[PDB]
Amino acid sequence: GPGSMSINPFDDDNGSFFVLVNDEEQHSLWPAFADVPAGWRVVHGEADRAACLEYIEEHWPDIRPKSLRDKLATGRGFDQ
Numbered sequence: 001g002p003g004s005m006s007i008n009p010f011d012d013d014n015g016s017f018f019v020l021v022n023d024e025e026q027h028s029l030w031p032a033f034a035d036v037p038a039g040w041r042v043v044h045g046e047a048d049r050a051a052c053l054e055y056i057e058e059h060w061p062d063i064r065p066k067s068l069r070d071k072l073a074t075g076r077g078f079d080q
Contacts, residue, residue: 004043005068015076017055019044021063045076 002023009015020030022040030036032046043063044055 001041001067001070001072003041003063004066005041005071006066007043007064008066013078014051014054015047016044016058017052018042018046019055019060042072045074047076 003021018029018032019027020036020040020042021027024039026040030040030042036042
């Protein structure tokens with residue numbers, strides 16, 4: 001798992017917008033209404049426009065190098 005398997009977030013609540021990378025150095029967005037195809041890595045899942053603004057304004061800080069077996073459970077969503 002390249003790049004983001006586990007992030008070190010200050011708050012983790014609002015997080016950021018959503019970004020899909022790939023082992024082949026590919027990077028784009030992913031269909032939130034579907035499952036991410038194998039070979040890709042989702043570094044950030046869907047979030048609010050606020051989180052969108054955070055991502056774009058930060059223009060991507062860093063990939064947060066933390067490669068692990070698995071940590072990518074579909075649990076991003078507390079109250080909504």
